[PDB]
Every structure is written in structure tokens, then in C-alpha cells.
Amino acid sequence: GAMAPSYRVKRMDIAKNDEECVVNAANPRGLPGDGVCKAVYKKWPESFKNSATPVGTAKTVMCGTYPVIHAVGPNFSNYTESEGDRELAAAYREVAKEVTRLGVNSVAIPLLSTGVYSGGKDRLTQSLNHLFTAMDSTDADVVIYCRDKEWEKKISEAIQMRT
Ligand SMILES: Nc1noc2ccccc12
Ligand SMILES: Nc1noc2ccccc12
Ligand SMILES: Nc1noc2ccccc12
Numbered sequence: 001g002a003m004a005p006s007y008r009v010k011r012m013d014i015a016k017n018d019e020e021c022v023v024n025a026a027n028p029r030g031l032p033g034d035g036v037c038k039a040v041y042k043k044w045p046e047s048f049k050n051s052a053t054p055v056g057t058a059k060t061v062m063c064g065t066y067p068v069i070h071a072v073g074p075n076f077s078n079y080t081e082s083e084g085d086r087e088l089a090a091a092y093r094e095v096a097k098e099v100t101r102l103g104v105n106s107v108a109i110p111l112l113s114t115g116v117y118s119g120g121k122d123r124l125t126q127s128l129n130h131l132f133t134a135m136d137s138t139d140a141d142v143v144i145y146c147r148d149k150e151w152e153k154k155i156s157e158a159i160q161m162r163t
């Protein structure tokens with residue numbers, strides 16, 4: 001565990017993280033895909049061997065000794081708001097199980113279902129609150145990666161609010 005488990009947010013490419021493992025915002029088929037997934041495929045391509053896993057689950061594949069946790073959030077274009085919300089919560093619970101099983105002291109994590117799977121809606125709060133529900137009982141240092149300057153401010157505020 002970390003000596004004083006924390007949440008932090010950084011605005012940069014998750015493929016340049018400084019943590020002991022990474023969560024990929026994966027597709028169910030283990031394909032190279034877009035956004036975070038595209039960077040993850042370029043950085044850790046060996047981790048995509050048998051990475052296919054259903055919506056609402058996480059599957060870990062090693063790149064050397066570095067763990068890549070493939071977490072499949074729902075595509076809100078296809079799911080109802082209700083079913084989508086259930087699957088997005090579930091994906092994060094499976095990430096918390098994997099992080100605990102691996103015994104890492106830190107994890108880099110993107111906000112699942114906020115990009116091309118968002119169904120054209122702002123899901124910062126919905127996705128972040130499911131991340132907190134899952135990860136609050138873990139003792140890993142969590143570092144959230146984002147791209148947008150206004151998202152960095154809102155994520156930083158949400159973390160600071162509960163401190
Ligand atoms: N400023 C940036 N260039 O590329 C990125 C990828 C992810 C997050 C931030 C950046
Ligand atoms: N949080 C992110 N959204 O898009 C990205 C692309 C590369 C790495 C991180 C991010
Ligand atoms: N859907 C998004 N717009 O900007 C972002 C920045 C970081 C993560 C997700 C989004």
C-alpha cells in the first residue's frame with residue numbers, strides 16, 4: 001500500500017505515467033481503438049494479447065512486468081442511461097479488484113466512458129464518482145489522467161472538496 005493513499009490529477013498522456021500500472025479505457029474486442037486506447041496500444045502493444053473482455057469487466061495483461069488493466073466502460077450510444085450507469089460502476093469495481101490483486105502502490109487511471117463512449121454527454125461527475133466509489137477502499141495512490149484544462153480544474157476541485 002501507499003504510506004498515505006492519495007488522489008491526484010494530471011493533464012498529460014497516460015502513456016507517460018509515473019505509476020506502477022495503467023488502466024486502459026479498452027474496447028470489448030481488444031482492438032487498438034482511439035484516444036487513451038490508441039496511446040496504450042502504441043506504448044504497450046504486447047498487452048493486447050487476449051485482452052478482449054465484456055462490457056463492465058477488467059482484464060489485466062502484462063507488458064514485460066508492467067501491468068495493463070483493460071477496463072471496458074459502456075458506449076452510451078448503445079446503452080440506456082440506466083444500464084450504462086450500472087456497467088460503468090461495475091467496470092470501476094473490477095479495476096479496484098485488479099489493482100488490489102496486483103499489490104501495486106500506485107495506478108494511472110482515465111475517466112471511463114467520457115470520450116467517444118460518452119454518447120455526446122459530459123460525464124465527468126458521473127464517471128469520477130464511480131471511480132471514487134470503487135477506489136476509496138483501496139490503498140494505492142491513484143493518479144487520474146485527462147487532456148482538457150477545464151476538466152483538470154473540475155477533477156482537482158472534486159478531489160480537494162473531500163480532503
Ligand atoms: N497536451 C497534450 N498533448 O497530447 C496529450 C495527450 C493527452 C493529454 C494531454 C496532451
Ligand atoms: N484522459 C485522456 N483522454 O484522452 C487521452 C489521450 C491519451 C492519454 C490520456 C487521455
Ligand atoms: N469528454 C471530454 N472532453 O474533455 C475531456 C477531458 C478529459 C477527459 C474526457 C473529456
Ligand SMILES: [Cl-]
Nearest residue numbers: 011012013016
Ligand atoms: Cl503529454
Ligand SMILES: [Cl-]
Nearest residue numbers: 113115116117
Ligand atoms: Cl471513452
